[model samples]
Target: MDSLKKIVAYKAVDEYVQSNMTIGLGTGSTVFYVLERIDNLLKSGKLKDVVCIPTSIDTELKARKLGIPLTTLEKHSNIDITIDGTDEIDLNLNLIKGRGGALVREKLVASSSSLLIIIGDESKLCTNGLGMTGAVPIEILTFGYEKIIENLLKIYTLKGCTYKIRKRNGEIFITDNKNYIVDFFFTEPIQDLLETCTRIKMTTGVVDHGIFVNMTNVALISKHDGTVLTLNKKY
Candidate 1:
């Protein structure tokens, strides 16, 4: 299953990436391959002047190590394409991201790109709806998590939903922006995700969420056995 990450990553870059393009890189295990592939192409001179904007601090660190040319949105706001992955993508192409803890920057990068290419293994696909896989990650302000938690419990509409603070090794996990993650769990798939996205956005102390609504341009999903399926966003 992990091998499928490379297939889609390769298929995406080999076909879409070319010389002298501004690329927006994302996070996660799947995106690790995209970084390496881009590095290989840059080193071989197949890609020239390919500046990249990484979606997270660690991603930028990795890009620096790989000798990938780095720039900021301040330098190049109009990115040619963004290559990324998702935790879950539903039938309408809506995505639940941020499981990698980079959703805030990842979403900003994706929002700026002309073409957003999402590459992932087929396991992320949800034929039914979003939230099928697991929790909906929402970054919140650590300064006032108590107020935020109470608001979340009241605002979240899904039945049987529970909340947990994202942590690692018994300690709270800190995001690149020094924020906290609230894993909003649900027993069933979500309906009306676009509405839900707005509802969450309106909540104070709540930063951007994993719900990526109507933002994806194309999705490259790699099924088993090196087969990649291209799904163009409808509407």
Candidate 2:
């Protein structure tokens, strides 16, 4: 995991920026490291006059604090490159992202970008979708949360897991999109992940969820021994 993170951090910084401009930023702990490295590059005069369109409010603030030029979807309709981290990745390049609860805008940013790069470590790569590294995070409106959860339970009976409302103590933790998050976990494996993901997408009140199918362009996995493994989409 550490190898993948470090490899992605260094390589993404090199690939994410151009001579004068760039765009797209997503939120996550891994992305935080990416932003810090980019900031340092700007300070060292290795990069100049870069324009960034960020996915979350927190990322925008990070850019601002680093004095990096920032843009918005309101100002620019397209972004050149987008770099982000995924919670799980498969051999087919299918992914479950947004564990940080930023999938709504992350998807938007990815849709707007010409190229998207996903960074991951060893622990994230999974053989099948069942009982993955983390609960498949879904962002939804608060109006029908219980209804949505109950509906989900009817279809898939998860094991050794709970549905969390992303709360601290008793209060709900709000996301940047002013929405709530529910992380539903399964102790065992899931069957037919592609089909399961499709079902999740059709769920009501779901604004966005993690399952990213056939969307990633590249996977930069850094191994524990300091080796960077690069995989391209098969199609």
Candidate 3:
């Protein structure tokens, strides 16, 4: 997994990153390799004058540790490129992220950037649609979150779907933005991804959802044998 991640991460950096560009950094295991490669590029003088906006606190701390120049989305909201990772990606390049609990910030950066490069291993691919193995993680305000979930249940019944508050160490998992994550699981692929995203977004107290529809510009998928597959969004 590490080697496969490195292959695509380096491909993204070598093919996309440039001098004097504002880049958005993402959070995930694959992104760990991305940061490492960027650090090496900066140290070796192959990349310079590149400002970075991290999608989460974990990513920001990692960037600081690597001596990567950092900025904020508030200051540099218009980004040149964002290199991130996805949990599941379909043939159309629509992504299901937020397993790392950074979907809100990741979506913000992706929305603001001109290009979004997603890197991941081949196992993350989904040819049919989303809701394969992982759930759609929705970030929500802790206050009245149960009410929000109730309303969500009104839309998606309790039949083949279920919701669980994310936890770490037997306690509620808290995001860097001080929010809670509610993971929605389904037995099969959702019939309408856009409608599901819209419904989740409309629910009160909901901050963001993990489904990223039609946002990817390029997807770098690494195979088991170190081969890279590129999936580009249709223009």
Candidate 4:
């Protein structure tokens, strides 16, 4: 499955990325392959004069380790392209990201970029419904996270959704922004994603949610048969 993801990641970088562009580097296992491709292209002179804005500290450190030139959103102001991975993507190109716990910065970078390209294996496609297999990751301040989670459940219970605090090795996971991640799992499909995002964003202590509504420009989905299909947004 990861092999297919690697294939699509390489293909997306080869097709969409170019020289002298401000790129938005996304964080995730699949996106690491894209960064590797970009770094190799830069080293081989196939791609040059490019700068990158990393969406998370993990990505920034990895990019620095790969010698990918780094910049900031404040410095660049305009990003040409962003190649990222999604936990789940519907046919409409809408995404559920932040499984890597970088949803806040990833959304910021994606929102700023002219083109947001998503690469992943076919399993990431959610044909049945949203949050069928994956939970919507939400970043929140830890000062009063429990209350926020309580409020979140109240808002999402109508959709059969429940929330849980993300943990690693039996301890809470902290994000690059010094916040906690609360993943919302849904038994049934969410009906309105834009409204969900808006409602979650309006909640106090909530920083960002993983429900990316209509933000994707292109999705490079790799099949088990070693082929990639590109899905573009209609509007």
* Clash count for each candidate, listed in order shown: 0, 4, 0, 0
**Inter-residue clash pairs, candidate 3:** none
TM-score of each: 0.96, 0.86, 0.96, 0.96
Candidate 2 regions with alpha-carbon error over 4 angstroms: 1-4, 128-131, 156-162
List, residue by residue over 75-145, the lDDT tens digit for candidate 3. Answer: 64689999999999988888889988899999999999999999999899998667868778989998887
| Per-residue lDDT value at 196 in model 4 | 79
**2 versus 3: better lDDT goes to:** 3
Model 3 TM-score (2 dp): 0.96
In Å, residue 234's CA in model 4 sits off its true spot by 3.7
Candidate 1 weakest ten by summed lDDT: 152-161
**Candidate 2 at 163: error in angstroms?**
2.9
Which lDDT values do the candidates have, in the order given? Answer: 0.87, 0.75, 0.89, 0.89
Candidate 3: segments with Cα more than 4 A from true spot? 156-160
Cα distance off (Å), candidate 1, residue 164:
0.6
lDDT of 1 by residue, 36-114 (tens): 9999998988888889999999899999999999999985489899999999987678889998799999999999999
Candidate no. 4 TM-score: 0.96
What's the true lDDT of residue 219 in model 2? 78
Q: Which stretches of candidate 1 lie over 4 Å from their true place?
A: 156-159
